[PDB]
């Protein structure tokens, strides 16, 4: 546009995939992650179904659609699938040919290292990348927020991660990851859901729990008191009118599955609670280093926008931790585009090159030309 | 955006302290430069800058979170701030600054390799408003840093006197033979059959666009000369 | 300052580098002695980490920081890094050139010769000296605290020097070093401390063992009297809040640790108490210059600071010296800023010029010119 040239900024999870142009401090057209084929085998001549449905089109029906999601954090069931998911966003939403504009994709922290030269032989070999990088999920939050000195715990729907980055990446392990999150919450309502006459059998209408659940599902503060307060029908039970139509009184239903975050022992899982894993990285780092990381905690993604969780940090974190100083959680209040905040930084910064593989730089070094210069 | 302008300074000279036209006082052995300022050479001379403000005096980006809210109104003061939307200046609204300045610097210089432009200097007399005071100190300088006596040694080539053969030609005429309009056309060998008439060297001389090459100063009052007794 | 011109005062040790402007009383900015690097690789690029992290700003955040002492009493482990010590030193605190203003450094007694030589190749060579001498330690403070006739044992945290000088310097040895002072302390601790539930693991938390040690610390003055005495839990048992959020309830821990300065034979050395040394440096002295030296001690350093440090010596020395006239030590109670008061004298004294050495006596004698003229 008589400025630069090739540029534009992405980021995709197990939610939303963020992207939009050159320069931009929001996302433009974020989409869902999603693509199935039909079980329905779709009028087969109202045309040759093919196309999974993926985009606006597919979350617009759901009913036709199988939604088998491809990337489940970390893991990725096939990639045949996310041939025709990219095809999608720079082609369709973007606007863009691949073949001009770099790219800035988000990398799940401790991803499979065959996966990676296995992305790249998408892009390079066949959609023509001259220039992109894959930068780490949550370090690009902590420029963006403001902060170079605090602990970052950046996770929505993909994978928990508890990045202590306020003077360094990539040295003592200091890090967790688990799979515990969105897609999980999204799947065990169905079971207790069964108790009261509900049963969101499928995938398909599977997505639309978590549509009901970002709109009222809160948290409790403290179970015990809320277990008498059970009693008094009023800050429970709420009507919400299905779109189709069937009224469902959630009330317990609220602060009982959101409970399975502090504590994964509902689900088998030994993994200590976000609060817990959160000392296992302190105690790592130096004794005189952590008054300073409890100032200030840095709490984002789409998981820390339900009611009653910041507050709930500050009373379990006090009583395993240091009393003296004062401590103060920094959870944005719209904490979910963190990343992509972050992400319009590094996408303006020309220190950047020193980072990003040019299209010789994967002949001159073979397909490991990515875990040989990046980490 | 935690990064002040103090840490910015240190940015600079990692990056660089090796590339010409840049110093401070850690590799700058120099006093005159602070502990919170830096040095850097422009044309003729050293300028020591401070690092108060930067930040908000730079950036000044706008968003259109804050711009819709407002032109959402009705009355000609309000939207009118805002006139009939992008006055031929847009392309793309949202853009952290950075670039944002570059527009203002990159329209100006696109809009100069395709057109045709004429140059005119200027030079201030003196502090006083007086048409006939000279600050010596002050003029001297003022003729230096914008290096214009270096343009007329340096187009031309480098050296003392010097005559444009466009003016040469139709000024010394009427002295040699064969500078007729019987003349050929180049204006080397014709030049050559003027000089090798009355004996001179022809490396003193050479031949460029439009400028007389003759090396030190004391052929010129020996050409001037040599015009006066032989020829009122 | 239209006063004078070319003057500074200056002086190092094993603590602080204690230093300020020209004709000055008192220090002007001390700053600990410190250079380490990054062992957690500081977010490498929220800045090419580099700046070992010296000075206030070292000092301030620890954590990242391994702290790696380069001069430990005597021994110098590098001169490298020494490099950007004195690089901080002359430009960022001091704000002046070091070609201009002469220097007034320190010289651990009995330094070796060939690192003399190394440090004028830092100063004449790069730094450009045209003016400087390194004075010997103890014998400055001599002329500070008033006195002539006195024998001094001044040293905090670099090496014990026992120098009896009340009538000349350099003649016979009469002189010990010890490498038994500071940082001995500071690591023996971690040790001891590992039987109650507490351990300072790395050098970073190592250097605040030091910071609490010398605001409680003392010295039992019988240990047979305060052994019977831990029963009650009064004098001993102290709350201290370490400063992040961890009592140590130190009683106990206070004067046993200090018992190894007497008892030097709690860390595998023969060394004899600093009481012993003393005899020694004495009795080579003539028979008919006792009475004198008895009667007036110096008793300098930071480490003659704690409770019960004065009061012992006068029970140890009279046992195994002449008992007929009175004994008096004369412990200055801020004795740690002795020799830069000291440093003060010499640095405006005139006499001085036929010490330092200029910058064309280092051309005309070569890099012997050091032990060719001083001593
Ligand atoms: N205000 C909100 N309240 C509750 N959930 C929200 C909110 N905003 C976004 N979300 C949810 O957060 C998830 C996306 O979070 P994100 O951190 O981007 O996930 P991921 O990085 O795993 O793709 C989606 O399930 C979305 O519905
Ligand atoms: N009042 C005090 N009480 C206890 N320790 C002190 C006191 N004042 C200074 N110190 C300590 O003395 C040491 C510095 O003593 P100093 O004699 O200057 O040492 P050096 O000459 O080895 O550098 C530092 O460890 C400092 O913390
Ligand atoms: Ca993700
Ligand atoms: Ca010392």
Redesign the interface.
Known sequence: ????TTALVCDNGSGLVKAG??????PRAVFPSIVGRPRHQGVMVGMGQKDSYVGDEAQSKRGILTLKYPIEHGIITNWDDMEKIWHHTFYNELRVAPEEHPTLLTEAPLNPKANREKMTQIMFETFNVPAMYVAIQAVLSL??????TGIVLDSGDGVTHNVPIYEGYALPHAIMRLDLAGRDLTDYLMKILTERGYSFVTTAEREIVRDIKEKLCYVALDFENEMATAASSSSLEKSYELPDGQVITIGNERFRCPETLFQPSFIGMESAGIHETTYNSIMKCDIDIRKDLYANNVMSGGTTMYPGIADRMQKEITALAPSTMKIKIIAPPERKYSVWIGG?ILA?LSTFQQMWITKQEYDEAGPSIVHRKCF | ???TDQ?FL??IC?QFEKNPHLQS??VS?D?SIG?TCFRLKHYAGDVTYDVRGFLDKNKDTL?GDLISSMQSSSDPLVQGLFPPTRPEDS??R???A??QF??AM??LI?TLLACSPHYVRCIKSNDNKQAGVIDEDRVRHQVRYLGLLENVRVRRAGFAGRIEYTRFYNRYKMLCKKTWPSFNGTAKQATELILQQHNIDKEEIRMGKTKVFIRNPTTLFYFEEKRELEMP
Chains 1, 3 share one sequence.
Do not use: H, L
Request: glycine share 6%; proline share 2%.
């Open positions: 546009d008589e400025d630069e142009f050159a320069g931009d401090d929001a420029y963006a927020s403001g902060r170079t319009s303006s | 955006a935690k990064s840490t240190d940015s990692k006082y850690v052995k006093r502990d968003f392309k793309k949202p853009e952290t950075g670039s570059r527009n990159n329209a696109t």
